Amino acid sequence: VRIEKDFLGEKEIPKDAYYGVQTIRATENFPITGYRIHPELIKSLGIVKKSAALANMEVGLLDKEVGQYIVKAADEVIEGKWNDQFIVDPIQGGAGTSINMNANEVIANRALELMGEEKGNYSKISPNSHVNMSQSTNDAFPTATHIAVLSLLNQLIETTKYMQQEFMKKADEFAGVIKMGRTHLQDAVPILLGQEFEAYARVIARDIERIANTRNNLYDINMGATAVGTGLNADPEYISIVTEHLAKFSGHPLRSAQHLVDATQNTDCYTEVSSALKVCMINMSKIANDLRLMASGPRAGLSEIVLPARQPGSSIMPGKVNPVMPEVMNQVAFQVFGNDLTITSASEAGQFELNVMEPVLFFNLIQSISIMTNVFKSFTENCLKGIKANEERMKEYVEKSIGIITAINPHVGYETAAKLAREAYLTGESIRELCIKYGVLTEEQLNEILNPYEMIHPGIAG
Amino acid sequence: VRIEKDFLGEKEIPKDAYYGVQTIRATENFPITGYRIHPELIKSLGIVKKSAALANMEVGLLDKEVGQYIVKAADEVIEGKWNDQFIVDPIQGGAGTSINMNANEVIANRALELMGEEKGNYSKISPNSHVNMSQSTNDAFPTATHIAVLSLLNQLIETTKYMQQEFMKKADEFAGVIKMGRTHLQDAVPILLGQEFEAYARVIARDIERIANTRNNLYDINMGATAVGTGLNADPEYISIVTEHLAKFSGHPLRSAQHLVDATQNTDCYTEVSSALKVCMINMSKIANDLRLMASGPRAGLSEIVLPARQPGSSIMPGKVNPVMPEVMNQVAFQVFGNDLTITSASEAGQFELNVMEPVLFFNLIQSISIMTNVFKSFTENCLKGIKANEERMKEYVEKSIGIITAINPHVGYETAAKLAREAYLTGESIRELCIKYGVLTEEQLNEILNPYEMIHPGIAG
Amino acid sequence: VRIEKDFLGEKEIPKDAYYGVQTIRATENFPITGYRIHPELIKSLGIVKKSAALANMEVGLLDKEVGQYIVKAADEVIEGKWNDQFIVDPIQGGAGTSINMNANEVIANRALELMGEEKGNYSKISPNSHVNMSQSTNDAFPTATHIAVLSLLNQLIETTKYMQQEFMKKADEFAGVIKMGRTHLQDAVPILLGQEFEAYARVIARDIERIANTRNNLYDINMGATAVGTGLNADPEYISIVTEHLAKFSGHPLRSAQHLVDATQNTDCYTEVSSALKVCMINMSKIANDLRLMASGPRAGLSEIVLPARQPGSSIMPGKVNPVMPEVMNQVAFQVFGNDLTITSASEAGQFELNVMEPVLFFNLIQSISIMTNVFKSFTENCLKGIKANEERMKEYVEKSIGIITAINPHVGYETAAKLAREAYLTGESIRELCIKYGVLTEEQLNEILNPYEMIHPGIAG
Amino acid sequence: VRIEKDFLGEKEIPKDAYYGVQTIRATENFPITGYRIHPELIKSLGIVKKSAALANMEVGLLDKEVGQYIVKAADEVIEGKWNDQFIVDPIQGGAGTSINMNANEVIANRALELMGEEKGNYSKISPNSHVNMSQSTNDAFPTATHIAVLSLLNQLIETTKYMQQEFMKKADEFAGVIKMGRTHLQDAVPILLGQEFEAYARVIARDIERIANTRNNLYDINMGATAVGTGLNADPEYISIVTEHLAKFSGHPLRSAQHLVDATQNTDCYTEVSSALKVCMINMSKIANDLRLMASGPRAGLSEIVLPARQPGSSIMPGKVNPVMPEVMNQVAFQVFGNDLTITSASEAGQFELNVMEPVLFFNLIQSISIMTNVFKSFTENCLKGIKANEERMKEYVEKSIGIITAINPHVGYETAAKLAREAYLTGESIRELCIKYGVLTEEQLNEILNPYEMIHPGIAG
Structure with a gap:
């Protein structure tokens, strides 16, 4: 057992746990979904805390003895060695203060444990005075998020560049396959399966460029902004030094916003990304619809293509193989759509120098990015690569046609x-x-x- | 020409015009869509103004010699003899005041004309002090909407019941047309065509229920709530009398809200109506998708049914008959989905004793009820009624199916x-x-x- | 280790695990969110499986020896003793076939283990021939869901009836508190804090009635519908008997749909519920906005009310106590909004006799219901009950006012x-x-x- | 009167009318909104028809004697001399054919009049065989939209840049007005008024970027794609020539799509534009909310700023000045949010070689670009420019703050x-x-x- 001083009273914390009173309070205040923040946000929090400790030691604001162990602690966090210590809910009040504190307390006690000390002794290492030094919940939280979203975004970009390319191999694979083009679902004139499949690759590529480009306004961080973003009592040298640490340790071309009050209260960069991901799923959903249509049949449907089987089929029904893969693609599209409304709502709910609705907003942004990467991965592997055509079936469709x-x-x-x-x-x-x-x-x-x-x-x- | 002074300056009101500076200024401040408020809202404004004129005279607040004319004029507004005079933008700030004042000015001036006076002579009949006597934008405007929406709602119900019954007819008419069922767009087991049509008739019947039941919450009006909803200085005999007058001339079982404050700031009844319409359109859209699919072909598609041709087919290419009606249905469904988001958003933007975002809300709500009734009629008359079946095609489908x-x-x-x-x-x-x-x-x-x-x-x- | 025959090859299953090849395949096919279906859906699946085994034994279609152990197994599931065996993703392709199978395989192997047998021996007890007997993935999945949603819904209703009542205690508590009513955020005439707080209770109560009423169309189940809902080869006596078992074991007034094809392809009952929950959060979000406004200050804000403290406040800033509770209420409102778009999209994406988009739809419906119940619980306990007023502050606001x-x-x-x-x-x-x-x-x-x-x-x- | 035969029967076209049976039938099939297509779309139709007439004559497909007149007539349509003749519903089925035919008929008849022939004599100048020569609804309609949207887009950019600059002026003008910052609506640390205004100017500047950059994808047109996008029988010299003619008369850097099939079925560029507009309006709405808050009061509210009075204040109650302009701003923001959902939905509904839901999509897209430009102008001229500050009030706020x-x-x-x-x-x-x-x-x-x-x-x- 243990015990930590909280204005709400003395609370008990498992001797094995690294989070403190503040995190527990958060757990009691907002027990909404039961979800844990994404490990990448955790990792990014680690990076943010590590980079701050450093700059603080360099400007000489943090005791180099303590700030020395804090780093090795934040690094352990970054390596994903404490994703269980982050128990707060993605959907929380306090515009993210609890997510900051959950990380501050875990990095503080580990740092304390590391230099042989008592975890609960916030006099040796204060998660609020040392770990959260030269930083406010309004600049550390967003920065960690920008970093998280950026890292995550790149992963999606590559998983889509791969999918998109596999979409081309099929375009050429079917570059000779002739069929009937349908407009209004009504028979039209002939068209090549490869022309439709290239059509898919082209919109997807266009999706990659748009998604990729949303990273720019995400590169500007507001580390150094105090509470409101006016940098009151903030050391300009700390800002320049911490920004650079973040950049190198995060592998991102991070930059320090030219206007901190702006970079503190505005959230338009988040919606810019959601909007791109939405447009992407709109297209992918449509492509997933065409796929289910062409796969229809085998007897009373179009039967233009054949998707590999991924789920056992009814014995009495030979031929019935549901396009389960393209279907799960449609559902993720709907989710992303929903997340973009939630994200839209949180963004405009901002007031004055701070938008406290950021937590639910980030939960959705990161979710969208995640689930998209995953369906893309499995959809291409478990379906796209193995699409076969029924050339004969389509050939005759063109013979019996009028167009x-x-x-x-x-x-x-x-x-x-x-x-x-x-x-x-x-x-x-x-x-x-x-x-x-x-x-x-x-x-x-x-x-x-x-x-x-x-x-x-x-x-x-x- | 004519000159009417305004705290903003002198504006030249057209001689033949029945509106005034108030209305003009609104046209200047809000040149957004250029649309006109639905004539049912206009008619409702006329009823509200009439029901107020009579009540104010009975309780001795309004000069019976003037009031008499105001009622006659409001009567002309109810008959839709002056819809042209309502020129304010459905999308406007001021929370409806422009709309309310447009009705107050038009009725005020038309009344002065009837009693042989110069239009614009607001000394005899002040649109603000006479036509708007004993009421507030906050209770006149919302009550008018309550009446308008209710009226449009009842019409939508008639047209939907008609459509629902026509679906039943098709269900009976095809009660014996065997075809091949599909799940995942994959061949399944056999099913009767008429069964799918009763499946539609039922969900629609169920929509009629949900939609109609949303009328109840609109029955409670807040007439006599004044500014906030405290009824400060309002005469209970005026309220009593005016509420009874509104129900009588509107034709609806209007009830005076039990908590006028609650009724003056909450908008939960409108989101409730929009919710019911959105659901209905969801069902209606799925149904349209089914129709366009069952009409696909002829040679390279399902070809289960034949929809009546409305658009002239390919000048010289036979067989291609686009399902335009089911398509225009799908689009309206999309409009209502967006309208519901606007309404959701305008509803939640409420603040304290008044939701100032009502105009955009009401504009979208009414638009949904309107465009839905409109396609429902056109779709049943120009499609639904004449749907024919390809009994043989579906017959062979069941015959050559491995299911x-x-x-x-x-x-x-x-x-x-x-x-x-x-x-x-x-x-x-x-x-x-x-x-x-x-x-x-x-x-x-x-x-x-x-x-x-x-x-x-x-x-x-x- | 172990090994089960799957058309995709022989797979290994942990000797401790109860799920079979099919579930693993699902895990590999749709590794989207990483979430586990809600324990209530699990419990409901248990009920559905138990009630089917029974009816099957009564109609004599299931060997009474095996179907005897299956029950005790399904009961263990119902008691929530196997929520870890359900590993499939809420967002999956196959319109829910994997969720059905995950339950079928867990109930099958436990039943096998229970009668001293080998878990993997689907010859003694087949999760597909015994457990999933007289049922299809298109009637068991939805039924379990209807039951889940219904159980969940009641819990929300009571948690809101409580909140709503606590909202009234405050209405009376402040029934004498005078303040300034604001329309347009602009000072208006006086109003009682209690009138605003009753206004809140009244919309909430109206929310309870609407939410409560959505349960009706949810009471009709389609158990007995075969694949397409035509009940092909289904024993009418099985249907009548199983329906009743579900009702008694689920504590719901379940009913057997009058039209099974309709109850199989339509999903309007799901959207009806989402739409009610959305309307509820619209209101709650607005109430949460007023709460943050009245709590603003203490010096440069309105300072009408004081919410209890739930999260530590900055030391140098005495008085600053963020309305973290009302804020998390706003975020859940946004989530529900987003889930309702996702839900809307899945519902209209239905095709012919089956809507395969139901899985992502149910994930959202159940999420909304859940998170709402939770914020309601903690919001009232950790904020509502303890709201205090600054009568003096407001009293003078009325003195210095013009209205x-x-x-x-x-x-x-x-x-x-x-x-x-x-x-x-x-x-x-x-x-x-x-x-x-x-x-x-x-x-x-x-x-x-x-x-x-x-x-x-x-x-x-x- | 006049009589024009239609495959549906004989319709009496007005003598003074320039449209024909095609247009009339469309009015019958789609009496949805009653609106008229934006005059910029009308003008664009005229350009497309002109650019096609000249190309068809150069390549010898169109009789230069007739073509000559068609061009002159199309020229009048470009000058907006016949907007009255365009009567089809923006919301229509047929995927735009009615809109296209309305332009084909109007131009065809006006041309016949110019060359001294009876209107309706489609033997001399067939709207289908001459005015629509070498094109398809599928390429004429979308290309016109591409041109219309681009034109409206550039205007929105001008009006937004103007507004963005006016915000900067306010930022400089208040560069020294100290006030009290707020986070969570809770007192925070001091901040400059002008800093909040530059915070707005910046996000808006950032919107200008995002919005303008969405023009690029619209530059690629699919003129000459025919039905599906295969260009079947289309002359490459016609395409080449027509594309060059479109860019010249439209004023935009139009480029002939590299993959005409991709450009004929994908709609990802429109969702991309709507995405950029929605984001902008999110920022704009947050800003409006801030404004109404900073204008609240006078006595019982923030009262940080003074907005210019546009609506006549309370007849005899001074001090109450509703922020109508920021309000009408918020509402437009809500419209665009809904419009984006409609567009998202219409976009994903695409099928195979053609998205037939484009009309509702284009209607909403154009509407957004239109109403945004309209409030942006009105808001800057009737509010933004005249915003005054209560320097003293904010001064004392900073003075008596515990922050x-x-x-x-x-x-x-x-x-x-x-x-x-x-x-x-x-x-x-x-x-x-x-x-x-x-x-x-x-x-x-x-x-x-x-x-x-x-x-x-x-x-x-x-």
Whole structure:
């Protein structure tokens, strides 16, 4: 057992635990979801605390003896050796003060334990006077988040660049596959499966550029802003030195905002990212819809493609294999949509020099980024790479179609092409047959026209 | 021309115009959408002003000689003889005052004309002191909306009940049209077309319930709440009398809110209505998606049903008949989804004794009730009623499906059920033509098993 | 170690684990959030499985020896003795098939272990042939959910009835507290703190009725619907018997849907609930905003009320105590908003006889219900019950105000009341002083007018 | 009158009317909102039709004698001389065909009039075969939108840059107005007014960036994609020429999409624009909330600033000046939030080679760009420019605050800082009048410490 002085009374803390009274209070105040902050935020908090201790020792504001152990402690945190000590809820009041304190108390007691001391003795190492030195809950929390979101964002970018490329391999793999293009779900003119699959790769790439670009306004941190961001009593040399430590230790081109009051009360950089991730899932969701449509059947559906099986199929029903992968892609799209509304709401709920709604906002931003990376990973591996086509099925879909007339029209004139089209539609005979029966094009003269490639690309009539 | 002085300066009001400086200034401050308030809101304003004029005269607050004219004028506003005079932007600040004043000025001036006086002579009939006597923007405006929304609501209910019944007709009409059910867009077991249509009729019936029941909370008005909702200086006999007058002329069971303060600051009833509309449109959209899918084709799609052609088909390409009506349905569903977010947002933005964001809220709420009633009518008349079925196409779907085997299993043992199926899965041989060309059930017997009704209904295995 | 036959190969399962190959596959296919389904869904799955085993034994479809142990196993599940065996992700493809199987395999192996057998021997007890007998993933999953959502919903209703009542105790506690009502955030006329607090209780109560009422369409289950809901090969006696078991064991007035195809493909009942919960948080969020405004200060803010302290305050800043509780209330409101968009999207993404987007939809519905219950619990305990008022502070706010003139106006006429009001506004002297200086009302004659109660309620001028 | 035959029957087109059966039928099928397409879309349609007419003539596809007239007519449509003739509902099915045909008919008939022919004589000038020659609804409509949105976008940018600069002016103008910062709406440390205004100017500057950069993806048009996007039968010289004509007359750096299929089915660029607008409005709304708060009062509120009166204040109650402009700002922000959900939803509803839900999407997108530009102008001209400050009120706020002590701590030791503060917390004695009436810093010295600039800026403790 143990006991720590809290204005709300003396509380007991497990002798094995590293969090202090403050964290417990947070646990009692906001027991909402039961979730634990993402390990990357934890890692980033470690980085933020380590970089601050350092700068503080350099400007000489932190005793070099204590601030020496604090570092090795923050490093252990960074290495992910204390993700269980962070028990506060992602959704909490206090605009993040509890997330800051949970880290301050864990880094403080470990630092105390490390230099042979009593964990609870905040006189030797104060999580609030040493660990949280030269920093406020309004600059440490956001900075750690910017770092977390940035690290996380890069991981998504690469997982999407991979997916996007695998989408191209399929575009070429099917670059010769001919089929029927549908507009309004109504049969139109011929199109190549590869043209649709490249279409997918192109929107995805466009998604990568947009997501990637949201990182810029995320690179500006407000470390050094005091409470309101006016830097009251803040050492300009601390700011310059800590900013650089964060950058090197976080591997990000971090920068110090030109205006701290602005970088303190505004949250537009967070929404910018959510908005990009939303646009990405909008597209991915649509692509996931086309995938389920082309996979429909096998008998009473479109049956254009075949997705690998990922979940056992009913025995009495051979052929029924649900596109479970593309489906889970649709659901993540919906989640991201929902998170973007939650994020939108938190952002505008900001008041004056501080937006206290940041905690629920960050929980969603980081969630979206996470779940997207994960579905992308498994969706491409467990579905995309192994997509096969039913060329034959689609080939004939083009034969029994009417739209194919557009290709033929130029070689027969509108007058006859229309007659051929109408009749074939009413009687049910392929347009190919009507050209021979009515004698207007020979079997050979027809294939030289029904050229899959030349038929799906712009060009003269010859 | 005419000149009306304003604390902002002199504005030249058109000679033939019935509005005044108040209305003009509003046009200047809020040139947002350029739209006009729904004529049902205009009519409602006329009722509110009339019900107030009579009450004020009965309680001796308003000169019966002037009041008499005001009532006659308000009566013309109720008959929609002056909708042109209402020019303020549905989206405006001031929490509705511009809208209220537009009605106060128009009625005030039209009244002066009736009693042979110069329009704009607010000394005889002040729009503020006479037409707006004993009321506040905070109670007149919201009460008008309560009446308008209720009226539009009842219409939506009629048009929806009509539509719901037309769905039932289709359910009966197709009560025997067998087709192939799908789950995950994957072939499943057989199902009756008419069953899907009753599935729609039911959810819609259920919408009618939810929507209609949201009327109750609107019945409570806050007329006579004055500014905050304290009724400060308001005469209980005025309230009593005015509430009774509103119910009588509006046609709704209006009730004077038990807690006028609660009724003056809470907007939970509007979010309740929007909630019910959004849900309805969700159902309606899923249904439209189904329709466009069942109409896809002809050659390369489902082709289960035929929707009546409204848009002229491809000039010379037959067969392509886009499902425009179900499409315009889907879009309205999207509008209502966005409208509900606007409403949610405007509702939560409330502060203390008054939610000043009501105009955008009411504008969206009314718009939903309006556009929904409008497509519901157009969709049932120009699509729903004329939907025809491709009985044969769906018939063969059930026949050549490797899934109808679930309906035959009990009669041929779970052993022979794997051979007659898994074989029909490769050779593609009809599951029926296989029973014959193998021996297990005689044709006349095989039809009592694959019967359209008992095959799509609950029954003991064998 | 162990090993189970899966079409995707032979997989290893920890000898201690109760889930089988299928669950593992689910774990590999959809590793999205890392979350575990809510223990109540687990409990409900238990109930659903237990009730099915029973009915199956009664209709004699399940061997009474095996189905005997399965029950005691499902009961152990119901008692929450295996919430760790359910490892699948809330967000999964397959419209919930994996959640069904995770329960089927855990209930199967425990049942096997219980009758002294080998867990992996699906020949003795098949999670797919015994446990999942007379049921499909399209009727068991939703039913368990309806039951889960219903149980959960009641808990919220009571936690809100409590909060709502505590809101009234404060209404009366402050029934005498006078203050300044604000519309547009601009000073208006006087109002009682108790009138605002009752206003809160009234919207909340209205929230309880709406939330409570959403339970009705949730009472209809579709147990007995086969795959598509046509009940193909389903024993009508099984349906009647299982439905009743569910009802008694779940404590809910469960009913068997009149139309199973409808109850299978429609999801409108889920959105109905989300929509009610959304409306509730809209209101709660607004109430939480007023609370933060009234708590503002202590020096440069409104300072109307004082919320108990829940998180340590800056030492150099005595008086600064952030409304962390009302803030976490605002964030949950945003979450629920987001979940309602995710829920809306999943509902309309339904296709034909089955909506496969139900998993992400249920994850949100259950989350919303949960987090709301939790914030409600702690918000009332850690904030609501202990709200104190600064009567003095507010009393004078009414003295230095102008709006107070409205109360006085009747006893002095518009001519003089306006002069008194203007001057006091320009010079800065209270209206009370101007009445004595200008001699128009004596100190006594003024207090008999500035009666807090008579001033905040409708009435004549005498 | 006039009679025009339609596959639906004979419709009597008005004699003075320039539209035809196509347009009329659309009015019948879609009587949804009753609105008219934004005149910028109309103008764009005229440009597209002109750029196509010239290209078709150059490549010899269109009779130069007829084409000549078509161009002149399209030229009148570009000059907005016929906006009245465009009567189709912005919300329509058919994926834009009605809108496209409305432009094809109007231009076709106005051309026939110019060359002395009977209007409706589509044998001379067929709206479908001449005005719509070499194009498809699928490429004409989206390209027009690309041009319209781009044009409106550039205007929004001008008006926003203007507004952003006006904010800067206020930032400079108040560069020295000290006030009391707030976080959690709780008193904090001092901050400069002008700092909050530059905080706004910066986020808005940042919006200008994000918004403008979304123009790039719109630059790529798909003109000449025909139905699906295969360009089947389209002449590369036509495309080349038409794209160049569009850029020239539109004024934008239009580029012919590299993958016409990708450009014909993806809508990710519109969601990208809406995303940027939504974010901007989030910032703008937070700012409006701040404004209404800083204008609250006068007597019972913050009263930090004075907004110019636009709505006539309480007839006889002085002091009450509602912040209507910031309010109408908040509402527009809510509209754009809903519009973004509609757009998100319409975007994801895409299918295969065409997203048929574009009309509702474009309607909302354009509406956002329009209403935003409109309030941005009105708000800066009727509010922002005339914002005055209550320098004294804010001055005393800083003076009587128990928080200014953080700015004096370094000079009086962390020991005397607890006595001079915690005492001023109860007696309410000025933190300054306490330093004097206690001895620690001389008046002339106490002012170099509590200086408005160095007190709100980063600096070494002492």
